[PDB]
Amino acid sequence: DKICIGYHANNSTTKVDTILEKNVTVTHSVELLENQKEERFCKISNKAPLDLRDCTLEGWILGNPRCGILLADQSWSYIVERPNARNGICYPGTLNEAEELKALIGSGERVERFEMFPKSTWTGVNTESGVSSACPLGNGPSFYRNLLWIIKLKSSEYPVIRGTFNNTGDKSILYFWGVHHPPVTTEQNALYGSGDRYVRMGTESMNFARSPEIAARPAVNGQRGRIDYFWSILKPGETLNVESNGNLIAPWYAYRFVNKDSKGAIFRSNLPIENCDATCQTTEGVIRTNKTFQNVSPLWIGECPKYVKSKSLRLATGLRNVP
Amino acid sequence: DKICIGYHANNSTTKVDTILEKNVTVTHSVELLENQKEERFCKISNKAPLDLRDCTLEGWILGNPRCGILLADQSWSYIVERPNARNGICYPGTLNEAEELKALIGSGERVERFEMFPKSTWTGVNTESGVSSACPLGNGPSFYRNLLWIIKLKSSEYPVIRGTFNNTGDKSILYFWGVHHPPVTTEQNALYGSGDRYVRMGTESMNFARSPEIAARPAVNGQRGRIDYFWSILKPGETLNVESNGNLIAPWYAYRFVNKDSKGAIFRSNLPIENCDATCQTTEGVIRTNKTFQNVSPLWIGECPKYVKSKSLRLATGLRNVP
Amino acid sequence: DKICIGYHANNSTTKVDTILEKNVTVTHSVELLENQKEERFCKISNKAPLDLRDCTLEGWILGNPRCGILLADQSWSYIVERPNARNGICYPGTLNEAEELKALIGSGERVERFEMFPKSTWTGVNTESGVSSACPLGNGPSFYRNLLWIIKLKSSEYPVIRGTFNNTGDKSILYFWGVHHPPVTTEQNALYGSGDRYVRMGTESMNFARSPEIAARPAVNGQRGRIDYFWSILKPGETLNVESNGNLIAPWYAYRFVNKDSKGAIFRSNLPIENCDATCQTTEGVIRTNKTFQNVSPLWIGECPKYVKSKSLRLATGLRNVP
Amino acid sequence: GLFGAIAGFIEGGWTGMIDGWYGYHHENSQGSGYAADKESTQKAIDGITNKVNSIIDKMNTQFEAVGHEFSNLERRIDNLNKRMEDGFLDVWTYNAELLVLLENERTLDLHDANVKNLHEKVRSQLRDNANDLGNGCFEFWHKCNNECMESVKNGTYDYPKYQKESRLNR
Amino acid sequence: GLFGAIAGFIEGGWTGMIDGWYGYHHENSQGSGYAADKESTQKAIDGITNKVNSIIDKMNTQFEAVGHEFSNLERRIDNLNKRMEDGFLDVWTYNAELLVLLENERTLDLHDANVKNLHEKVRSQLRDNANDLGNGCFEFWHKCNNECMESVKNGTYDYPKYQKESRLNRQKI
Amino acid sequence: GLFGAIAGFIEGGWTGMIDGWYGYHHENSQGSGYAADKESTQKAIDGITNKVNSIIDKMNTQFEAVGHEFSNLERRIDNLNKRMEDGFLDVWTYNAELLVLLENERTLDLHDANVKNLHEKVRSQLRDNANDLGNGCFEFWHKCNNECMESVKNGTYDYPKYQKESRLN
Ligand SMILES: CC(=O)N[C@H]1[C@H](O[C@@H]2[C@@H](O)[C@H](O)O[C@H](CO)[C@@H]2O)O[C@H](CO)[C@@H](O[C@@H]2O[C@H](CO[C@]3(C(=O)O)C[C@H](O)[C@@H](NC(C)=O)[C@H]([C@H](O)[C@H](O)CO)O3)[C@H](O)[C@H](O)[C@H]2O)[C@@H]1O
Ligand SMILES: *[C@@H]1O[C@H](CO)[C@@H](O[C@@H]2O[C@H](CO)[C@@H](O)[C@H](O)[C@H]2NC(C)=O)[C@H](O)[C@H]1NC(C)=O
Ligand SMILES: *[C@@H]1O[C@H](CO)[C@@H](O)[C@H](O)[C@H]1NC(C)=O
Ligand SMILES: *[C@@H]1O[C@H](CO)[C@@H](O)[C@H](O)[C@H]1NC(C)=O
Ligand SMILES: *[C@@H]1O[C@H](CO)[C@@H](O)[C@H](O)[C@H]1NC(C)=O
């Protein structure tokens, strides 16, 4: 008669590493790291992404005429920009504080497009024919659909022009303006006028004034001229006074703006957006798992497992498998 | 006859968590985290805090006329700034590098107020009546107590004025100046003059020169004009040359500045200050403990236990309690 | 007859720390931290460091006449800057974006010196006689070897001058220019002219413009005038247009620049560079070890062990030594 | 600290015991069979489940970098971001990989101890009524039926009941 | 792992022993009583106190956030700071909470081992002069007075002193 | 996690055993001598070597600070950099110093276990053919020559072979 004390063993070939021994076979274990992804974008909490398509982020909010599909109301969970978008800042010049603008919009949830300043606002000037071959829509020349290029009247002179917008509205306003810089004085005189010219912007919390910097510079997109692009936020309750006697690229349409409750994201990727749901969206793809760690990406929107460099993180739960 | 070997047990019901089991009663343990606080401010190293009361930090160092209470030398252990202070920059305009200024003063221990440029420095001008309804003291108009509004003489014009301060002194000096921007050409002519006007500041390490940006701006405290506020540090040994023929808001009173040997703090709080001493002061209150961790706030002055998100961190020292 | 089971013991007096007991003698152990260093600089991958000698970093890339030793092609592994170098910005004024420029040079491997704008470029002006006692070369007064001081002709006015450099080349160009600020208007008229004067720079990606900011300033190196120094990178394919009617400190010699693929460094030290090779170079000295941790410096360029505050990190490998 | 039971004096495991980690093998005239000890098996499962959930729970938070952009005149703050993001990645990578190594060791030793204690639990009971073969098996100096075997398993072995019978077998 | 003594083969603790963690209970012709083992109890105190002080000492440094302010054009630098402050907060929150769990386990196991070792140290002496009841108790095959008990506690029990008397009670039972 | 063997019931070490960590001492009519147990010593060596290498491998990465400079109008980001670099410095110091304390305890407790287990391996074989002196030594109730001693050491001791001779004593 006998009785023995013993322990379990099975067909497992799964291994773990220990501090004293590596490649040690155990009966039961659990992988904590996920390395699989759906290379596509889905919906976060049933809210679709914003596809900027063949437009850069600048091109969309500035209103590059070839971004017409996107020139409307937009509500997103996250934004995805394509690496090789053709349609951006078509007329040469730099957008001041560009990166600060991307982060703001990134922290946005919803925008509403409206007309801040009708073309009739600017009395004494030519509000049409302010277009460029560098910003084409189809065949002929065009210009940004949120900005108004103003040149002097052929017959008279360019007088001081003024506009005012009282933001009695619910939400914050996001608007854009610019100063055009001709390459030679000849063009300065022709489009605007000689003498001292100024572009002046003002709110209760902002003070902006600029002058033309006429200089000969290299041609970009067939343009030796430049526009310094500027953006700002008109706070709720505040009021914008625009004052200029020359060289103004005026605000025309702008955006009522909505802040996002948690953090939002802007992905730069070629991955296709689809009508699907995800709890976890990385810039590299969607993750579906109950696991705790990842290999795919540090960049994500939603609720993802922690990102590490590890290839495998397997805890032993069983014991040494010894057949 | 018999003998047994056994282990301690008592009336303890204090519990700890282990990696294998939760809520396990042990005979002896020690809490490492403190979660109690005195909702008040106390004295650090026998030095009282500076309460800015109904004044913002800008309002105090600029000398907002309604901050008379604070008009003196100030020596603090930490600074406490009040959430809904009315008295700040009373006359509209922006203070350049505002946030860097707060960080500087925050790292300060003591400032001494003195007269940098007496009104006799500025010969040929009206040093009185440089006042505004936008900075009222009680009923009538007043103005900042560290700045001098200089306008033209009623009888004649405004001539070039000059000032010089050689800092042969002990410590670095913190001073303030501005450039005034009238809203319309009328006030420019009336207050200063029609020609080209300039404000010139210069030291061994700085070069400052500006002209007015006359513009109609939205009304703030009944003012369509603006003044650009500036601050800088006059290093020991350096020399300030002030030169202006218009639009100058001159330095008048300034501050000798003392660097704090360690880091200082600026709290934004409604908490009442009292007559008490603390070894460590948080923005949420006082901590009195020998424990190693804290639960109350990440922002503190003095010596506090480490801040963590934990509700409890209890080490077991005794053993599993089994009555 | 008997048999016993026992464990090893020896003459060791080396001790380690445990969580339950300190100062414990063990039979075998290993130190994980290295605390020894050679107080000198060596070669990283057989490339000598660049010793700036008695010149500051600014002084070298600007071409201070007293930095002639360094004014040539340079290829380095890291740069060592001497704490009390005399020769920096010899003519008073501030270098715009100085720190970003330092960070740029730090990520560099090699520079190539060439003449960007020959003096014959600037027709109608005095391209000679642009020198100062604040920037002496040998006996007489001089000026930067990468910058050109241009003054007005007595005989003729100072006209709009123009220059063009098309970077058809392999590599990026790092160049420098400036705007001169006379202390008084008399000198402005004498050197440049009685009207409004400007310095304007432009590329496919840049737009730059300035005017003189005249101010009465204290003497620095016997000069009450100032120059605002500027730098930028001319990308391959881009083109520089220079246009000015006054106050221009023109580019003259510049540098083709190569980006470092890896991490670069700039050390502030008095340590001697010598004829030696190193895998690990800290700002405090050379490390030669197989250990995992270090004590000497957080700043290093090669591939160094992790820096910690510990004095000793000794793991026990043997067992408790009980003779 | 290896406890010397698993892969020790008990040389191997049992593919025949499939309802638990720890258990018994017996032989009678009534037969033979495997039976896991559900007591220690359940306590082991509870501990390890708690251990794994606890580890998952402390890994709950995440450092999450963002895709903000920087100009060519913001090289420093760009690199600052880079060294920070890489900083925490290296820290959590370290914490994860090292914890797995250390606690796998702990987990495996835990089973080893559980086997050891169970064997001891039996040895302490049988005393001189059984022959300790040293390999985790016991030969009874008396006849031990199925109900007898159960008492060993139930932890209620009756030593003085069989002391008389066993001792007589010299 | 569990050394099987505490809440193991010794099913319960003693509220009657109040001067130590580890100890003895005896029964003889003069009566009964509890007595702590001052050696092993003190050694346990020194180790655990060292353990607690060492942990507190490595927790000595603090990450200290500040109250610097940022403009609406410094959103990125604002966000960078926050993710840093939250970063180190999550790291130390983790390090402390996990260390407590893991070292509580070790500490409890430590007491178990010390009791376990003490039981062996006594068993090793008595040998066959006493009966190992399997529950941490020993029954003497002889008369064991207070001095006898004392020698056991102090670790100086004289086995051959009582050897013959014992065999006679094992040759009569 | 003391197993009570090293500096326990085996009160002291052997400066006489120089070819291993764990081992034997025997006495017979043929002589006496020390001999390491090459198996268990080697298993411990491979394990400890692995422990040190695993730790070195996980400490491989480094936080690497830089020497970028800041103006006095960049006080905040300068302070931000400082608090970050010092931040991770305190973090690895914690990780480095605490790991040394905790695993040194483990390493020593491990050896203690190895000695205890090896001792168990011997006791389980000899049983009542030998007298357990309680200090890690066994006195044989029979005559145990070099071949006998080795079987104990090689783990091949023949219990019933010596049962008769032993019991008579
Ligand atoms: C089309 C126009 O409005 N003016 C062009 C001008 O035609 C004028 C003619 O209609 C009128 O009767 O008489 C005057 C003479 O008194 C003119 O002849 O002819 C010029 C010929 O050199 C054109 O200049 C060319 O401009 C090009 C750049 O721009 C266009 C463009 O982007 O496609 C035309 C756009 O309408 C215009 N946008 C405006 C005015 O809002 C832009 C704009 O001027 C610049 O882009 C801003 O810097 O220019 C080429 O540069 C070409 O080399 C140049 O000759 C007049 O455009
Ligand atoms: C199996 O063991 C349990 C104890 O764990 C026995 O139950 C106890 O039996 C005693 C007397 O036999 C009673 O005084 C107790 O009240 C019972 N319960 C407990 C919780 O101790 C049980 O009888 C055993 N089974 C067999 C078949 O012997
Ligand atoms: C329009 O602006 C005025 C002040 O400019 C202020 O009352 C408010 O912002 C707006 N008025 C109303 C009635 O909404
Ligand atoms: C015991 O466990 C559960 C939740 O884990 C609950 O009863 C209670 O929160 C715990 N005890 C204490 C003291 O928190
Ligand atoms: C250990 O050695 C150090 C070295 O001086 C000594 O200061 C200390 O008192 C010793 N004992 C400890 C740390 O318990």
Numbering used by the authors:
A (entry chain A), B (entry chain C), C (entry chain E): 1 to 323
D (entry chain B): 1 to 170
E (entry chain D): 1 to 173
F (entry chain F): 1 to 169
Quote the paper:
We used the pentasaccharide, α(2,6)-linked lactoseries tetrasaccharide c (LSTc), for X-ray crystallographic study of H6 HAs with human-like receptors. In agreement with the weaker binding of GD H6 HA with 6’SLNLN as determined by BLI-based technology, only the first two sugar rings are clearly visible in the complex structure of GD H6 HA-LSTc. In the complex structures of H6 HAs with LSTc, there are a total of seven strong hydrogen bonds observed between GD or TW H6 HAs and the receptor that is bound in cis conformation. Careful inspection of the structures suggests that this is probably due to the different interactions of GD H6 HA Q226 with bound receptors: unlike the strong hydrogen bond between Q226 and the hydrophilic O3 atom of LSTa Gal-2, the hydrophilic residue Q226 disfavors the hydrophobic C6 atom of LSTc Gal-2 that is placed directly facing Q226. The resultant higher sitting position of LSTc in the receptor-binding site of GD H6 HA leads to the loss of interactions of Gal-2 with Q226 and Sia-1 with H183 that are observed in the GD H6 HA-LSTa complex and consequently a weaker binding between GD H6 HA and LSTc. The cis conformation of LSTc in GD H6 HA is significantly different from other HA-LSTc complexes.
Receptor-binding specificity of HA is a key determinant for viral host range. HA molecules of human viruses preferentially bind to α(2,6)-linked receptors, those of avian viruses to α(2,3)-linked receptors, while those of swine viruses to both. Two H6 HA proteins, one from each group, were chosen for structural and functional investigation: A/chicken/Guangdong/S1311/2010(H6N6) (GD H6) in Group I and A/Taiwan/2/2013(H6N1) (TW H6) in Group II.
